[PDB]
Ligand SMILES: CNC(=O)c1ccc(N2C=C[C@H](NS(=O)(=O)/C=C/c3ccc(Cl)s3)C2=O)c(F)c1
């Protein structure tokens with residue numbers, strides 16, 4: 227996360243981190259339930275073996291809420307390809323259930339029509355992660371969050387050098403120095419409504435981080451609600 | 461602005477328009493209150509709530 231603020235105690239409880247064999251994060255995730263994590267399909271190419279960590283806000287101290295979980299089943303969208311980054315979504319079923327507590331809770335899955343009419347028409351959404359603090363910097367040792375404005379779809383398509391499919395949406399700023407970045411991909415984009423936070427996107431891709439005339443591109447979760455529901459039953 | 465487009469039809473969460481009237485519903489883990497509008501968590505650590 228470039229810019230933004232630190233997630234304070236209990237503010238980002240649905241954050242998950244995909245950690246490699248060396249216990250270092252390489253991608254985010256969103257907690258959906260005691261058994262399921264939502265992430266990006268493209269993250270499943272960034273490490274041979276990985277686990278999921280929840281309840282962590284500082285990677286350099288033991289806060290007492292941290293829990294590591296092994297993955298039992300990886301469910302990648304069968305229409306995803308690295309060539310287009312379309313259908314960039316996967317669900318992970320954990321071997322053991324997440325015990326909810328301070329800093330560990332699921333984000334709500336919304337209904338499609340209501341989310342598109344009411345949540346995606348709000349001014350902003352919230353992205354979070356342990357990713358880079360600058361395009362040319364190190365990963366954050368602190369979980370960060372950032373308010374990102376929803377971006378008009380026409381404006382996004384004109385600013386992009388790649389095809390923005392029906393399965394993608396844009397959020398962020400034209401020139402303001404705030405954006406998601408390297409290591410945040412697969413993480414949560416949530417939208418607040420009456421003090422309840424609903425999953426609205428997955429950090430997917432960007433042409434750099436926080437560049438002028440460029441925005442963050444997120445997987446449009448609302449297009450995949452039936453798919454997520456199916457994946458979480460098997 | 462009418463029904464659901466009018467302040468979310470007074471619903472806490474999901475709003476639907478059936479037969480010219482508002483119908484509210486809630487995310488899994490919540491139950492719709494007796495008023496047919498508010499959403500009540502069924503247990504601890506309900507989805508979408510910051511933890512206290
Ligand atoms: C359809 N477009 C693509 O196929 C595409 C385009 C650019 C990238 N790409 C190039 C550099 C970026 N790497 S990053 O780790 O810095 C991603 C950063 C993000 C910033 C805001 C986000 Cl939302 S994700 C990248 O993703 C990509 F992965 C796919």
Ligand SMILES: [Ca+2]
Nearest residue numbers: 284285287289
């Ligand atoms: Ca820690």
Ligand SMILES: [Mg+2]
Nearest residue numbers: 399400437440
């Ligand atoms: Mg920009």
